[PDB]
Amino acid sequence: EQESVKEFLAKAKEEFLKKWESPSQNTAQLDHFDRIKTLGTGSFGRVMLVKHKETGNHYAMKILDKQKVVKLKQIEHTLNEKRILQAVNFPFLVKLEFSFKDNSNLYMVMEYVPGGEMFSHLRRIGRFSEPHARFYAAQIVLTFEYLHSLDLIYRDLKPENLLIDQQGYIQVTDFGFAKRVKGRTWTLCGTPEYLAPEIILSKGYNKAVDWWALGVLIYEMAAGYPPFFADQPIQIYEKIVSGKVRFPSHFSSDLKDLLRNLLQVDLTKRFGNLKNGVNDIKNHKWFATTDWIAIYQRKVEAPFIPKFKGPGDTSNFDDYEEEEIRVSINEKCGKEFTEF
Ligand SMILES: N[C@@H]1[C@@H](O)CO[C@@H]1CNC(=O)Nc1ccccc1
Ligand SMILES: N[C@@H]1[C@@H](O)CO[C@@H]1CNC(=O)Nc1ccccc1
């Protein structure tokens, strides 16, 4: 690796650690924003488009209900998400601008990305050509090189978590499963189609699970469907652990060779987890045309520019039932969320 890359990552780790050791807290409040529209929902949280009343800027506000977080055993995960997001800085990660809490909820206010989720675009077009998939994959490779150098495992790669910005580049969102891990970790988490075998088999696992998930993502982008597809999770898991994958005949030979090495069941043989680390991926023939520096600098013209009218346009996101943001008169779960 060239010294310029080594020095970049050394500085990145210094800057991350300073914010990690001393996290920001309580940098806005709810009544500074107007609520516009729900952009996504989950079992313990939602994301809403909001507008800051004084500046007029738009943001995406993630709202987590403290009592639901406790019931679903996500306390440590939500504390990880905020502490990591307030400490990272990289071109292809969503930017956390504010965070705060109140009697009922936790709030993470992120920059709004108007192009929508990669998932929508992939399903609308069918599949991406190899150059188009490779443009996105290169950004994920650089983002995982950055996160892993900070001892962070991401653990939620899937097309829904990759937002497309106004220049057609990726912003990775949802750090709800991200964790700082030196060595192994054990939690069962992630979406079924993207889980590495060692997660399914309840082993201690490491950053190699993110490189497996990259293989699933590249396959899905280039084929239009994931490699271990089946109707119910137990059937998906049986396919994941089996060591077999069928490739469409339209895949290039280089793409199939890269995917055999990312979708390697034995983690000790998986690309990204060998002696040369991420460089076995960056130097693979499928990436021969990739200018890694130009991608990082956002100098490549993107394959696809989302269609939207302005920073408040939500047309690339879909419609959800609109529910109130209720805040109890009494503090809930104060002790559990003291550090947030
Ligand atoms: N599954 C998660 C649940 O809390 C509901 O939606 C979450 C995922 N969605 C986003 O993070 N969306 C987004 C959109 C624009 C900018 C920043 C973020
Ligand atoms: N297709 C674009 C559309 O906005 C109109 O013309 C633009 C031309 N640029 C590219 O396609 N760039 C690119 C870069 C990397 C990989 C694949 C493609």
UniProtKB/Swiss-Prot annotation:
InterPro entries named in the record: AGC-kinase_C, Kinase-like_dom_sf, Prot_kinase_dom, Protein_kinase_ATP_BS, Ser/Thr_kinase_AS, STKc_PKA
Family in the record: Belongs to the protein kinase superfamily. AGC Ser/Thr protein kinase family. cAMP subfamily.
Phosphotyrosine modified-residue sites: 320
Assembly notes: A number of inactive tetrameric holoenzymes are produced by the combination of homo- or heterodimers of the different regulatory subunits associated with two catalytic subunits. cAMP causes the dissociation of the inactive holoenzyme into a dimer of regulatory subunits bound to four cAMP and two free monomeric catalytic subunits. Activates cAMP-sensitive PKAI and PKAII holoenzymes by interacting with regulatory subunit (R) of PKA, PRKAR1A/PKR1 and PRKAR2A/PKR2, respectively. Interacts with NFKB1, NFKB2 and NFKBIA in platelets; these interactions are disrupted by thrombin and collagen.
Domain Protein kinase as annotated: residue spans: 33-287
Superkingdom, taxonomy of origin: Eukaryota
Xref: Pfam families: Pkinase
Activity regulation, per record: Allosterically activated by various compounds, including ATP. Activated by cAMP; the nucleotide acts as a dynamic and allosteric activator by coupling the two lobes of apo PKA, enhancing the enzyme dynamics synchronously and priming it for catalysis.
Top-level EC class: transferase
Protein's job: Phosphorylates a large number of substrates in the cytoplasm and the nucleus. Phosphorylates CDC25B, ABL1, NFKB1, CLDN3, PSMC5/RPT6, PJA2, RYR2, RORA, SOX9 and VASP. Regulates the abundance of compartmentalized pools of its regulatory subunits through phosphorylation of PJA2 which binds and ubiquitinates these subunits, leading to their subsequent proteolysis. RORA is activated by phosphorylation. Required for glucose-mediated adipogenic differentiation increase and osteogenic differentiation inhibition from osteoblasts. Involved in chondrogenesis by mediating phosphorylation of SOX9.
Cell compartments where the protein resides: Cytoplasm; Cell membrane; Membrane; Nucleus
Primary localisation category: cytoplasm
Domain AGC-kinase C-terminal stretches: 288-340
Gene, per the UniProt record: PRKACA
A GO BP annotation: sperm capacitation
Active-site residues, Swiss-Prot/TrEMBL: 156
PANTHER family reported in the protein's UniProt record: CAMP-DEPENDENT PROTEIN KINASE CATALYTIC SUBUNIT ALPHA (PTHR24353:SF82), CYCLIC NUCLEOTIDE-DEPENDENT PROTEIN KINASE (PTHR24353)
GO molecular function: ATP binding; cAMP-dependent protein kinase activity; magnesium ion binding; manganese ion binding; protein domain specific binding; protein kinase A regulatory subunit binding; protein kinase binding; protein serine kinase activity
Location of Phosphothreonine modifications: 38, 185, 187
This enzyme's EC code(s): 2.7.11.11
Residues annotated as binding ATP: 39-47, 62, 111-117, 158-161
UniProt entry tagged with the keyword Glycoprotein: no
Membrane topology, record value: Lipid-anchor
Modification after translation (UniProt): Autophosphorylated. Phosphorylation is enhanced by vitamin K(2). Phosphorylated on threonine and serine residues. Phosphorylation on Thr-187 is required for full activity. Phosphorylated at Tyr-320 by activated receptor tyrosine kinases EGFR and PDGFR; this increases catalytic efficiency.
Name of the protein in its database record: cAMP-dependent protein kinase catalytic subunit alpha
